[PDB]
Design a binder for these strands. Structure first.
Ligand SMILES: [Mg+2]
Ligand SMILES: [Mg+2]
Ligand SMILES: [Mg+2]
Ligand SMILES: [Mg+2]
Ligand SMILES: [Mg+2]
Ligand SMILES: [Mg+2]
Ligand SMILES: [Mg+2]
Ligand SMILES: [Mg+2]
Ligand SMILES: [Mg+2]
Ligand SMILES: [Mg+2]
Ligand SMILES: [Mg+2]
Ligand SMILES: [Mg+2]
Ligand SMILES: [Mg+2]
Ligand SMILES: [Mg+2]
Ligand SMILES: [Mg+2]
Ligand SMILES: [Mg+2]
Ligand SMILES: [Mg+2]
Ligand SMILES: [Mg+2]
Ligand SMILES: [Mg+2]
Ligand SMILES: [Mg+2]
Ligand SMILES: [Mg+2]
Ligand SMILES: [Mg+2]
Ligand SMILES: [Mg+2]
Ligand SMILES: [Mg+2]
Ligand SMILES: [Mg+2]
Ligand SMILES: [Mg+2]
Ligand SMILES: [Mg+2]
Ligand SMILES: [Mg+2]
Ligand SMILES: [Mg+2]
Ligand SMILES: [Mg+2]
Ligand SMILES: [Mg+2]
Ligand SMILES: [Mg+2]
Ligand SMILES: [Mg+2]
Ligand SMILES: [Mg+2]
Ligand SMILES: [Mg+2]
Ligand SMILES: [Mg+2]
Ligand SMILES: [Mg+2]
Ligand SMILES: [Mg+2]
Ligand SMILES: [Mg+2]
Ligand SMILES: [Mg+2]
Ligand SMILES: [Mg+2]
Ligand SMILES: [Mg+2]
Ligand SMILES: [Mg+2]
Ligand SMILES: [Mg+2]
Ligand SMILES: [Mg+2]
Ligand SMILES: [Mg+2]
Ligand SMILES: [Mg+2]
Ligand SMILES: [Mg+2]
Ligand SMILES: [Mg+2]
Ligand SMILES: [Mg+2]
Ligand SMILES: [Mg+2]
Ligand SMILES: [Mg+2]
Ligand SMILES: [Mg+2]
Ligand SMILES: [Mg+2]
Ligand SMILES: [Mg+2]
Ligand SMILES: [Mg+2]
Ligand SMILES: [Mg+2]
Ligand SMILES: [Mg+2]
Ligand SMILES: [Mg+2]
Ligand SMILES: [Mg+2]
Ligand SMILES: [Mg+2]
Ligand SMILES: [Mg+2]
Ligand SMILES: [Mg+2]
Ligand SMILES: [Mg+2]
Ligand SMILES: [Mg+2]
Ligand SMILES: [Mg+2]
Ligand SMILES: [Mg+2]
Ligand SMILES: [Mg+2]
Ligand SMILES: [Mg+2]
Ligand SMILES: [Mg+2]
Ligand SMILES: [Mg+2]
Ligand SMILES: [Mg+2]
Ligand SMILES: [Mg+2]
Ligand SMILES: [Mg+2]
Ligand SMILES: [Mg+2]
Ligand SMILES: [Mg+2]
Ligand SMILES: [Mg+2]
Ligand SMILES: [Mg+2]
Ligand SMILES: [Mg+2]
Ligand SMILES: [Mg+2]
Ligand SMILES: [Mg+2]
Ligand SMILES: [Mg+2]
Ligand SMILES: [Mg+2]
Ligand SMILES: [Mg+2]
Ligand SMILES: [Mg+2]
Ligand SMILES: [Mg+2]
Ligand SMILES: [Mg+2]
Ligand SMILES: [Mg+2]
Ligand SMILES: [Mg+2]
Ligand SMILES: [Mg+2]
Ligand SMILES: [Mg+2]
Ligand SMILES: [Mg+2]
Ligand SMILES: [Mg+2]
Ligand SMILES: [Mg+2]
Lengths: 55, 136, 74
RNA sequence: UUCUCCCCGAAAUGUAUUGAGGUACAGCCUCGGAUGUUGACCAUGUCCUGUAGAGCACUCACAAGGCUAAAACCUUAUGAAACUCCGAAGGGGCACGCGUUUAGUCCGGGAGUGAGGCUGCGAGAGCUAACUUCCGUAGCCGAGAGGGAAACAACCCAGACCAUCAGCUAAGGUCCCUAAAUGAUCGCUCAGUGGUUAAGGAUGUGUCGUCGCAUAGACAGCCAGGAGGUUGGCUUAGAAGCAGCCACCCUUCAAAGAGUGCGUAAUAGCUCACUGGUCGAGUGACGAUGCGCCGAAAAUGAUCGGGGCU
RNA sequence: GUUUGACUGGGGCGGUCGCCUCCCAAAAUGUAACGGAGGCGCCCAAAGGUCACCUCAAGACGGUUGGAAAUCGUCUGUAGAGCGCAAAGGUAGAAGGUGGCUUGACUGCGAGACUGACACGUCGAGCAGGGAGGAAACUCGGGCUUAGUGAACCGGUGGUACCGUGUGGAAGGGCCAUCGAUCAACGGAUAAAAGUUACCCCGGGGAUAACAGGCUGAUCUCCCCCGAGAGUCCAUAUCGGCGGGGAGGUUUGGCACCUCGAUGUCGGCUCGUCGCAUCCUGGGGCUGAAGAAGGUCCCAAGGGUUGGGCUGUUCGCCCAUUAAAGCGGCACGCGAGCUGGGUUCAGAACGUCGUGAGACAGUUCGGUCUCUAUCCGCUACGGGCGCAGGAGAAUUGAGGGGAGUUGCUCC
RNA sequence: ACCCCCGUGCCCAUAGCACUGUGGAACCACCCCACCCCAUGCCGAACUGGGUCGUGAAACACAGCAGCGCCAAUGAUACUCGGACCGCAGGGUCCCGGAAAAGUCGGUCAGCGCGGGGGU
């Protein structure tokens, strides 16, 4: 479950921002490997337009 | 025209109409396509036109009705005391809402009568004969 | 002909599946939208408050007649 | 209201004020101490709610009929901020973390702020006016440089520790001014539309449908024809197909309808519908959309930023 | 010597200022407006405690006074009633209607919570003293709830026996009840307070009006669609009800954006220049156009568009002409260009208002308009350099400016 | 164990109403009487006190039944968190999940305890 930022936090609502901050991403172009457990799936769904979910 | 009723003044916004998309009475019906207020004398001019063209004959139904008060502040004042007590009554009208519908008149004459009446309405509008219908 | 109005906070205060200590207020209401249940008491203004500590729980039947109640721990 | 670099970083809200450009308290900033994950997000469980919608079961309003001493009551049919038999999406509290993150709380020293602004969404006031006003909500400016939007606080992209004559990308772009395809394919508009509104109007054009008439020979062209009742009845001073009122009936036919338009106070006269010859293949009326046309008139010199582009 | 509130789409006049209810309020709570509606400043010794009983509105049929509704009888009858006042929630196993006994309309307390910045405000189990109703379980510390209100100070009254200045008293004070608040501008400056200034002054504001500009375009001006009729006849020669859609930005306005350490305001004069929705001239279509004289629409902005009386006037009316005597923009063009008649200073008078000081929608006579242009822009005139040698003359015309009206008569 | 009755609860309209049928000497009910315990703002109608008979008339209990209520799908749509747009504006669109109200199909005249009485 690979992820990266590809769109800025700026000018985005609060839940999107704090969620980007939770998922572990603090700069565009950050990537990460995330488990598929329901709450993490819900986070990466909440801000899915900011993220290039790998598969 | 003006109702004999209740609270003087109101508010305003919009969404597509529900309470009369289908022509129950009569044969044919002109029908609104745009969400304007219609109000009083606009209708009454529709009525008086069609009654000229048709009367001595035909049945004329006005399914719409000037419910909604609308206000005018006086003359030329600053945003002052309250709103303005009177001015004209309107009927909100959303597309697919049926305002008019004739009875006992040939197709072509209903065409011409709807044309006259619709040349003095803020909205453009389309006429139809009633397809198959349900809702009873 | 306009200036008037007034501000009195009302509502449910302790919602179902919450652990009220006894004497807690659980709903403020003007009438009897909630009726005091098993373990609940109601004051002059029809406030419902815990009689003894427990889990708050709601019983709903027909909106003429629902009741707040306490299911004590232990 | 004067010397430097480093770290964090607000407020223009609430309630009160002889208060309103002032001030107190709170809120939001910072510093030190304490706790020490209690914070944040997202998930599941649970409970609360009457908005969007909808609906007439009550209140008010209200459309066409029926019954009827009109009220009630029946069929059909609607409107609602102060109506609601109903009623979401969302939103709030609590638990848990089944899962990722990194704040939170208490105590004490120092504050500043309490004139906000724009836009999208939700309402009120207002013309469903305003670079308008007052609330709610998200974001930016405020205190945000950088790229785009000709120029341009706010809009789009993106949050600038310092150096580099290295690389990749966002919005946005690739004829020249200007970095980058005068790129590839199937189309569309010939208006400079593009690059300035609408009611309304039109055989502009491309795509789709629905209808009729037909090669036992239709549409438009041309030749011949165009009824007798009957100046149909009323009508008016006169109205005889054609000022307006009642119908639109019979004889003959291949056939000409008490009948469409022009004419004359009324007549007459010219043509129309329907019927033949000669042609000779399509033709005619509606309706949905694509892009264009007209409608489209202000003041110092014009222009899409400019050249210029089919 | 002082007082003479605040809000306020400028200020003033008007209205408002605390409290309750509903909508606004965007399904938690909260949420502004000179947004939309309505109420309170009380009431009840029983309308309270408790304990017993009863059940409403409305309609139909039937019946003495009655005659739609009174009173009585049967039937239907989640409430279509009632609940002291407003509205909302709630309510029939009553909080509604009636009777019995009664005061808990208590003293001392207060686990724990709602709500508020604070100070306030709300609810409340349960403990003691003592009661009330019930046979009893048990209910009672005012009312179905939500408005019927006022900190503190200073004082009236009744208890209590804390203080009490050397001592014992007493005067005085304290503690517990309790009286005194449209202190309504309702978190309440003093116990105690209205006007005026054009004779005016200071500190400030473009946080806020008057001018102008801006944004908007309701009002204003103008054009378009339909076509009822008028036009004897014919809707569209001309006209066009009731209605609809646009443009302009010259009117009155809204709003308050730059300018309150100053953007001089009406009219005239002078000087111009632009739009065109064209007054004249020029060209056209149509006509209810014979000719002539016209009507009206389309093209057209070259030029042209008079002199006087009245009034500050702009306008407008008038005289006498005219081809015509156009409408608007340019900070309602133009005061470092002139007037200064008009309105916005001091004097003075009338009418009116005010007891007054003073005021005005007013009316009237009077009343300082700042010698020197730095830059840009403009009109004129020179100096320099350039224009591949240095000189004297003659010249093409890229481009630019001026001009551009019209009558009358005669053939 | 089977049946039914008397009470009494959970659930309180899918369990309620209307038309209909069945019950009496088990049980309940009407019914008889009432000066008094007791009681009706007048009335034993209701509370109330003593009891057959009679009668299941009315009531109540049980059974039938879908005229009425009440329940109420699927398909779709409204609306909408989120994402991205159009229109000068009223207002509209697209992708993604959530998802009504009404109405149609149909479903119902209940279901589940405790006791006591009497039958077989
Ligand atoms: Mg966005
Ligand atoms: Mg709408
Ligand atoms: Mg919509
Ligand atoms: Mg409907
Ligand atoms: Mg920082
Ligand atoms: Mg207050
Ligand atoms: Mg302040
Ligand atoms: Mg502070
Ligand atoms: Mg710290
Ligand atoms: Mg915590
Ligand atoms: Mg946690
Ligand atoms: Mg609605
Ligand atoms: Mg239903
Ligand atoms: Mg953890
Ligand atoms: Mg501190
Ligand atoms: Mg310090
Ligand atoms: Mg403020
Ligand atoms: Mg604000
Ligand atoms: Mg309004
Ligand atoms: Mg603003
Ligand atoms: Mg600032
Ligand atoms: Mg920037
Ligand atoms: Mg910022
Ligand atoms: Mg920039
Ligand atoms: Mg740039
Ligand atoms: Mg721009
Ligand atoms: Mg700007
Ligand atoms: Mg800047
Ligand atoms: Mg590259
Ligand atoms: Mg791209
Ligand atoms: Mg290039
Ligand atoms: Mg190309
Ligand atoms: Mg059109
Ligand atoms: Mg033809
Ligand atoms: Mg002094
Ligand atoms: Mg003031
Ligand atoms: Mg008032
Ligand atoms: Mg709320
Ligand atoms: Mg909300
Ligand atoms: Mg506020
Ligand atoms: Mg309002
Ligand atoms: Mg009672
Ligand atoms: Mg006793
Ligand atoms: Mg107590
Ligand atoms: Mg005393
Ligand atoms: Mg002594
Ligand atoms: Mg004493
Ligand atoms: Mg106050
Ligand atoms: Mg005082
Ligand atoms: Mg005073
Ligand atoms: Mg004077
Ligand atoms: Mg003097
Ligand atoms: Mg001064
Ligand atoms: Mg200043
Ligand atoms: Mg300003
Ligand atoms: Mg102010
Ligand atoms: Mg000035
Ligand atoms: Mg003015
Ligand atoms: Mg102005
Ligand atoms: Mg200016
Ligand atoms: Mg108009
Ligand atoms: Mg103006
Ligand atoms: Mg403002
Ligand atoms: Mg200056
Ligand atoms: Mg002035
Ligand atoms: Mg012209
Ligand atoms: Mg001419
Ligand atoms: Mg002529
Ligand atoms: Mg003159
Ligand atoms: Mg003279
Ligand atoms: Mg001029
Ligand atoms: Mg002006
Ligand atoms: Mg001027
Ligand atoms: Mg000067
Ligand atoms: Mg003067
Ligand atoms: Mg006097
Ligand atoms: Mg003199
Ligand atoms: Mg003078
Ligand atoms: Mg000199
Ligand atoms: Mg030479
Ligand atoms: Mg030349
Ligand atoms: Mg030159
Ligand atoms: Mg039973
Ligand atoms: Mg029966
Ligand atoms: Mg037997
Ligand atoms: Mg009896
Ligand atoms: Mg029976
Ligand atoms: Mg479905
Ligand atoms: Mg989603
Ligand atoms: Mg959306
Ligand atoms: Mg969807
Ligand atoms: Mg449904
Ligand atoms: Mg049954
Ligand atoms: Mg049993």
């Amino acid at each position: 479950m690979k992820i990266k930022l590809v769109r800025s936090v700026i000018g985005r609502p609060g839940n999107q921002v704090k969620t980007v901050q939770a998922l572990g991403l603090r700069k565009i172009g950050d990537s990460r490997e995330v488990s598929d457990t329901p709450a993490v799936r819900g986070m990466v769904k909440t801000v899915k337009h900011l993220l290039e979910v790998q598969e | 025209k003006r109702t004999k009723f209740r609270k003087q003044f109101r508010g305003r916004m919009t969404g597509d109409a529900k309470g009369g998309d289908y022509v129950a009475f009569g044969d044919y019906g002109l029908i609104a396509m745009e969400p304007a207020w219609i109000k009083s004398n606009q209708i009454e001019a529709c009525r008086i036109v069609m009654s000229r063209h048709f009367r001595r004959g035909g049945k004329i139904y006005i399914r719409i009705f000037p419910d909604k008060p609308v206000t005018k502040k006086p003359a030329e004042t600053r945003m002052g005391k309250g709103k303005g007590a009177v001015e004209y009554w309107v009927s909100v009208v959303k597309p697919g809402r049926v305002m008019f519908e004739v009875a006992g008149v040939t197709e072509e004459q209903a065409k011409e009568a709807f044309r006259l009446a619709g040349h003095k309405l803020p909205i453009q509008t389309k006429m139809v004969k009633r397809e198959v219908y349900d809702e009873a | 002909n306009g200036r008037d109005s007034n501000p009195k906070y009302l509502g449910v205060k302790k919602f179902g599946g919450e652990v009220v200590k006894a004497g807690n207020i659980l709903v403020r209401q003007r009438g009897t939208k909630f009726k005091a249940g098993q373990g609940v008491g109601m004051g002059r203004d029809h406030t419902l408050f815990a009689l003894s500590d427990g889990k708050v729980v709601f019983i709903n039947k027909g909106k003429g007649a629902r009741f707040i109640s306490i299911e004590a721990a232990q």
